Amino acid sequence: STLEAEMAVERKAVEDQRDGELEARAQKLEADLAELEAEGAKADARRKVRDGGEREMRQIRDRAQRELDRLEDIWSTFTKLAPKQLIVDENLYRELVD
């Protein structure tokens, strides 16, 4: 009960700047194509802004995601147990130990 309650907790931060991220940077990109579109730069470097900026972006999303989620299992993982159950992760090992 409790425990997982604090799971969804950590999930909090997970999704919080899990947003402030791709929101943040995707926004940034939005700034690059933004001002970049005030004089007359051809559509190409604008595509570039958009797309490398994407890299920063989905990059970001992932960054949250990925991690965050993996995390979710290492929980799950946790959520479940049984003597004899292997230990190979290490990091987690503690992480849920500790």
From TrEMBL:
<comment type="similarity">
    <text>Belongs to the RNA polymerase beta' chain family.</text>
</comment>
<protein>
    <recommendedName>
        <fullName>DNA-directed RNA polymerase subunit beta'</fullName>
    </recommendedName>
</protein>
<feature type="coiled-coil region">
    <location>
        <begin position="19"/>
        <end position="74"/>
    </location>
</feature>
<comment type="function">
    <text>DNA-dependent RNA polymerase catalyzes the transcription of DNA into RNA using the four ribonucleoside triphosphates as substrates.</text>
</comment>
<comment type="subunit">
    <text>The RNAP catalytic core consists of 2 alpha, 1 beta, 1 beta' and 1 omega subunit. When a sigma factor is associated with the core the holoenzyme is formed, which can initiate transcription.</text>
</comment>
